[PDB]
Design a protein around this ligand. Structure first.
Ligand SMILES: N=C(N)NC(=N)NCCc1ccc(S(N)(=O)=O)cc1
Ligand SMILES: N=C(N)NC(=N)NCCc1ccc(S(N)(=O)=O)cc1
Ligand SMILES: [Zn+2]
Length: 258
């Protein structure tokens, strides 16, 4: 009886094995745009992905992760609210059964069809496992997806998904350029939070871009053909793998833009 995205093991149950689920810095949150304060001290984000080395794509039973070589400073996030250098380790998405839900963060209670998380760890802690134990260990760049025009830079991802349909399946996934998943603007909101899946550790500086990317209906339909289950097991479509918004508590959401 492991955690997941069902009625009997979904987000409202997670606290039983992971009590931090009820903590003071949980993610995601609703971003209330009128109250988020413009902070002129925030810097432009520096996204430096020119040397990114993707390696593999994995269906982990909860999402699919595109994994990177993080053994050197190649694909790094700097600037913005961050001190120091954060290396890209993986990206994944959360998405819905329908276009009207799927994102983790919400904007004035609006849910997007999906949300991309580019996960980075602070090099001062040496490895990801050490970084998740620190309040400034991770930086997750969150990007909303809306359904409209296709995103050309997502299609390579879409087209490999049939080969990793079920939990535990992986495939080669070299030479993928994550710059193709960004929007035009790097304007963002930021706040201190957590991982949005167990173990729910409170180690994340969240950076959520304001501008969504557009993907096609056909692209997101292919996400929804993935399975939570393993091969040969009863098919459970991998949909609605999002945690809903958690209480903000006293936390300030800051905007990089006026
Ligand atoms: N830097 C190193 N030499 N070593 C290292 N362990 N690198 C991280 C490799 C890794 C692990 C898990 C994921 S996943 N499946 O969680 O996305 C993505 C990438
Ligand atoms: N648990 C697994 N099977 N795999 C995994 N690679 N998770 C690693 C830890 C993690 C990273 C980013 C987020 S988030 N959703 O906050 O960006 C949540 C959790
Ligand atoms: Zn995520």
């Amino acid at each position: 009886h492991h955690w997941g995205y069902g009625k009997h093991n979904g987000p409202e149950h997670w606290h039983k094995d992971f009590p931090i689920a009820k903590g003071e810095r949980q993610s995601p949150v609703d971003i209330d745009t009128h109250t988020a304060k413009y902070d002129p001290s925030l810097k432009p984000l520096s996204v430096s992905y020119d040397q990114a080395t993707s390696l593999r794509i994995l269906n982990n039973g909860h999402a699919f992760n595109v994994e990177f070589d993080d053994s050197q400073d190649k694909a790094v996030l700097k600037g913005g609210p961050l001190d120091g250098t954060y290396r890209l380790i993986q990206f994944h998405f959360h998405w819905g059964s329908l276009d009207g839900q799927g994102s983790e963060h919400t904007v004035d209670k609006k849910k997007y069809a999906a949300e991309l998380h580019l996960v980075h760890w602070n090099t001062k802690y040496g490895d990801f496992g050490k970084a998740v134990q620190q309040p400034d260990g991770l930086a997750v760049l969150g990007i909303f997806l809306k359904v409209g025009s296709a995103k050309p830079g997502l299609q390579k991802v879409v087209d490999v998904l049939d080969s990793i349909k079920t939990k535990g399946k992986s495939a080669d996934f070299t030479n993928f350029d994550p710059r193709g998943l960004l929007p035009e603007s790097l304007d963002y909101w930021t706040y201190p939070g957590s991982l949005t899946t167990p173990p729910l550790l409170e180690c994340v500086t969240w950076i959520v871009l304001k501008e969504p990317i557009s993907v096609s209906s056909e692209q997101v339909l292919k996400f929804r053909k993935l399975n939570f289950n393993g091969e040969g097991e009863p098919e459970e479509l991998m949909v609605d793998n999002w945690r809903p918004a958690q209480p903000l508590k006293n936390r300030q959401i800051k905007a990089s833009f006026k």
